[PDB]
C-alpha cells in the first residue's frame, strides 16, 4: 500500500505503523479462513469488521487523540489505510458509531430503507436481538 503513494510516510508514522501492520495481519487471515461452518453471510462479516476498526483507529488517533497531525492523517486516507468515505459519516451528527457504508445506503434495500441496525436500537423493540445481514452489526445508533 505504500508503493501506491510514492511519497514516504510523514513524521508520525512510527506511532501508527505497529498497529496498522496488525490490522493487515488480521485482514489476511479473514480473507483466507475457511468458508465452512459459517453462514453464507457470516463469512463476509470479518472483512467489514476489520475495515471498520482500521478506519476507526486512524480516525480516533487524529480526531479524539490528536496523536497524528493532519499530514499523516491525510496520508493514511490516500494510502487507503482508512475508509475515508466511511469516516465522512462518523463526522456526521447521528452517524458517529456507524458500522459499514452498505447499511446506510437505502437504495440497495427492497423497500428503500436504511438497514435495521440503524433503527435507534433502543427504540426498536423491548427484547429483539439483531444481526443485520450486511455486516452482523447489532445496532449502531444506541
Partner RNA sequence: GUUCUUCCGAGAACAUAUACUAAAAUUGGAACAAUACAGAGAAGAUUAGCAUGGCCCCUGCGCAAGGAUGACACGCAAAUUCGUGAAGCGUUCCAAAUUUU
Among residues 79 and 103, whose Cβ is nearest to Zn ion? 103
Q: Where are the alpha helices (DSSP H) in the chain?
A: 13-32, 45-59, 71-79, 85-90
Among residues 58 and 119, whose Cβ is nearest to RNA? 119
Distance CA 111, CA 106 (A): 8
Does 132 participate in binding Zn ion (rule CB under 5 A)? Answer: yes
> Judged by CB under 5 A, which of 50, 58, 103, 119 binds Zn ion?
103
How far apart are CB 115 and RNA at their closest, in Å? 4
Q: Which of 111, 85, 112 lies closest to 100, judged by CA? A: 85
Distance CA 54, CA 61 (A): 11
Residues 6 or more apart in contact with residue 31 via CB below 8 angstroms = 47
Does 115 participate in binding Zn ion (rule CB under 5 A)? Answer: yes
Question: x-or-dash pattern for Zn ion, window 43-82, by CB under 5 A?
Answer: ----------------------------------------
Residues that bind Zn ion (CB under 5 A): 99-100, 103, 115, 117, 132, 134-135, 137, 140
Amino acid at each position: 500500500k505504500l508503493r501506491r503513494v510514492r511519497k514516504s510516510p510523514p513524521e508520525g508514522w512510527d506511532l501508527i505503523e505497529p498497529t496498522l501492520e496488525q490490522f493487515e495481519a488480521k485482514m489476511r487471515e479473514a480473507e483466507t479462513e475457511p468458508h465452512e461452518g459459517k453462514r453464507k453471510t457470516e463469512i463476509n462479516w470479518p472483512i467489514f469488521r476489520i475495515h471498520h476498526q482500521r478506519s476507526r483507529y486512524v480516525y480516533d488517533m487524529y480526531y479524539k487523540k490528536a496523536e497524528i497531525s493532519r499530514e499523516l492523517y491525510e496520508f493514511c486516507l490516500t494510502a487507503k489505510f482508512a475508509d475515508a468515505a466511511l469516516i465522512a459519516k462518523w463526522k456526521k451528527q447521528g452517524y458517529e458509531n456507524l458500522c459499514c457504508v452498505k447499511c446506510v445506503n437505502t437504495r440497495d434495500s427492497n423497500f428503500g430503507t436504511a438497514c435495521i441496525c440503524r433503527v435507534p436500537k433502543s427504540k426498536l423493540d423491548a427484547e429483539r436481538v439483531i444481526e443485520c445481514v450486511h455486516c452482523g452489526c447489532h445496532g449502531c445508533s444506541g
